[PDB]
Amino acid sequence: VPTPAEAALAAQTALAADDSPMGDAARWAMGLLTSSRPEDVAARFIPTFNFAETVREWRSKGPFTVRAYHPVAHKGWVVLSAPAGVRYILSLTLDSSGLIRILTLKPETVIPDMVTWNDVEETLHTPGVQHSVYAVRLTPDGHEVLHASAPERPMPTGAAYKLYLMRALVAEIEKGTVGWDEILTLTPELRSLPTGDMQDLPDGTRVTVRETAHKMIALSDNTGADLVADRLGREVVERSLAAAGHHDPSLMRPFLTSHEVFELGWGDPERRAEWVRQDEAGRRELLEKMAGVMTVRGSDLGATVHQLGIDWHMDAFDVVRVLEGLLQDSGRDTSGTVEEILTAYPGLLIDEERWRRVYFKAGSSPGVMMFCWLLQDHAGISYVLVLRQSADEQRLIGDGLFLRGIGAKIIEAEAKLLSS
Ligand SMILES: O=C(O)[C@H]1/C(=C/CO)O[C@@H]2CC(=O)N21
Ligand SMILES: O=C(O)[C@H]1/C(=C/CO)O[C@@H]2CC(=O)N21
């Protein structure tokens, strides 16, 4: 088991040797912090990306020593020690060609090693935050509950809704009303905000249903999700919540697009008061009227709106059901297309000798964080873990490394917590 000096050395060597988009970006960002030029910056970041002042302030906190390095596809984390035992984390999020979309340097997110489920509960609890943890083993005859806190509580789940969108899509593929190689087309009206990269494509860009669905899940691409929802139609997306496991489908009807959550949640306050006042008919009518090119920008987001219904609400059982349904859908798809999409991005570095397959999905919105995994071993034993937080203030939740890291520690301690 690596001692402190061993782990920091291994992290440092791995960062230097990491021949990948994350390795390239992580090494470059570390150089900004440890060395002594607007063109080289602009070339490292997304085209639509103050920063000089940001970097100056970062550098004032050093010198930094690399203590841990956690590359995970387009997401990365570097744990740094500064003078006097003070630790920070550098977080990277990349686009599809390895340009930096998000780069932060923040106080360290501390997650202790978990021995018991009570460790989990006591670590996670935050006054003013509602949380829920649900862990099950799936069996032919129902689910064995390993741990449960508030699974029956419906909570906002952000892009976890894209699990239902995926199931709706597979349902239509099986019916032959849509094809994996059918072409979807990006239009101004169909463009949404990040998470994702597809919004950065030119108007009129032609993309397959397959690659759109891949990015919708793997990159949580909001524009990719909105492209699929547009192609399927809202009625088809909705008329599948009942089939695909949902305790109260009325909570997601109308089943909002990401464009719609963004535009309604952070646009015109009167239009938002109209939603709150309206019944299902008036809300469908409001959304039809709102249809068009977004006016809301990422800079407008902040206040929480999930408490108004402007999010996607589900209970922990619903999340287990849709993941279990996806497992089944994947198994029926002899082409492996569904499986490849579901497994591309497991959200963590996974022990592949232990786990044959891992599905993952996150959701986040102001005041909302969630992570869920389905992990199946090589004997075919499946576990699902569902972690959720909601609050009236986004600062009580933070950037989601906490909740993800809790999952990470649970999964690390699987022989204690999951498979004991
Ligand atoms: O895909 C991920 O891992 C992203 C995400 C996407 C949800 O929009 O939300 C959580 C917060 C974060 O960085 N995670
Ligand atoms: O393996 C872990 O402990 C956690 C972590 C914690 C940050 O120090 O970073 C990686 C991403 C994640 O959830 N893992």
Residues 184 and 104 in one domain: no
Q: End-to-end distance of the chain based on CA atoms, in angstroms?
A: 21
237 Cα: distance to centroid of ligand 1 (angstroms): 22
At residue 359, the 3 state secondary structure works out as strand
Q: Are the C-beta atoms of residues 390 and 396 closer than 8 Å to each other?
A: no
* Short-list 54, 288, 99, 272, CA closest to 194: 99
Q: Is the peptide bond before 4 cis (omega within 30 degrees of 0)?
A: no
Method: X-ray
Contact by Cβ (8 Å): 152, 215: no
How many whole angstroms from 198 Cα to the centroid of ligand 2? 27
- 159 CA to centre of ligand 1 in angstroms: 8
> Domain boundary residue among 73, 95, 112?
112
- Atom 10 in ligand 1: residue holding the nearest Cα: 362
Domain containing residue 64: CATH number: 3.10.450.280
Q: How far apart are CA 355 and CA 338, in angstroms?
A: 18
**DSSP one-letter code for 45:** B
How far, in Å, CA of 146 to CA of 352, rounded?
Answer: 22
Ligand 1: residues with CB < 6 A are 75, 158-159, 195, 220, 347, 362-364, 400
Helix (H) or strand (E) holding 90: strand 87-94
- Furthest C-alpha separation in the chain: 63
Are residues 153 and 95 part of one domain?
no
HSE at residue 150, side-chain half, CA atoms within 13 A, is 15
The parent domain of residue 94 ranges over 1-112
Site to probe by mutation for ligand 1, drawn from 257, 364, 404 as the one with most ligand atoms within 8 Å of Cβ, is 364
In this structure, the dihedral spanned by the alpha carbons of residues 300, 306, 311 and 314, taken in order and rounded to 10 degrees, is 160
Tell whether ligand 2 has an atom less than 6 A from the beta carbon of residue 158: no
E strand or H helix that includes residue 325: helix 316-332
Q: Is the dihedral of CA 15, 41, 224, 220 positive or negative?
A: positive
Question: How many angstroms separate the CA atoms of 318 and 340, rounded?
Answer: 23
Tokens of 105: 């340097």
> How far away, in angstroms, is 402 Cα from ligand 2 center?
8
Residue with CA closest to ligand 2 atom 10: 70
Do 135 and 75 fall within a single domain?
no
The CATH number that applies at residue 263 is: 1.10.8.620
Which amino acid makes up residue 261?
Answer: V
* Contact between residue 100 and residue 93 where contact means Cβ atoms under 8 Å apart: yes
**The ligand 2 atom nearest the CA atom of 404:** 13
The DSSP element (H or E) to which 106 belongs, if any, is strand 100-107
Given ligand 2 and candidates 110, 111, 113, 369, which is best to mutate, with the most ligand atoms within 8 Å of its CB? Answer: 111
Reference 278, options 268, 286, 270; nearest CA is 286
Cis amide bond preceding 63, omega within 30: yes
Looking at 112, 138, 154, the residue that finishes a domain is 112
Question: Which amino acid does the sequence have at 342?
Answer: L
Q: How far does Cα 323 stand from its chain's mean position?
A: 15
Query: What are the residues whose beta carbons fall under 8 Å from the beta carbon of 245, sequence distance 6 or more?
Result: 317, 318, 320, 321, 322, 324, 325
Domain harbouring 250, CATH code: 3.40.710.10
341 CA to middle of ligand 1, Å? Answer: 16
Of 124, 115, 35, 109, the residue nearest 70 (C-alpha): 109
Residue nearest to ligand 2 atom 1, measured at CA: 408
Number of domains the chain is built from? 3
198 and 86 share a domain? no
- Are the C-beta atoms of 315 and 210 separated by less than 8 Å? no
Task: Tell which of 78, 112, 146 closes a domain.
Answer: 112
Contact 337/213 with Cβ under 8 angstroms?
no
Residues 212 and 249 in one domain: yes
CA angle 369, 119, 415 (to 5 degrees): 95
132, amino acid identity: S
Q: How far is CA 276 from CA 63, 224, 234, 316, 335, in A?
A: 51, 28, 20, 25, 44
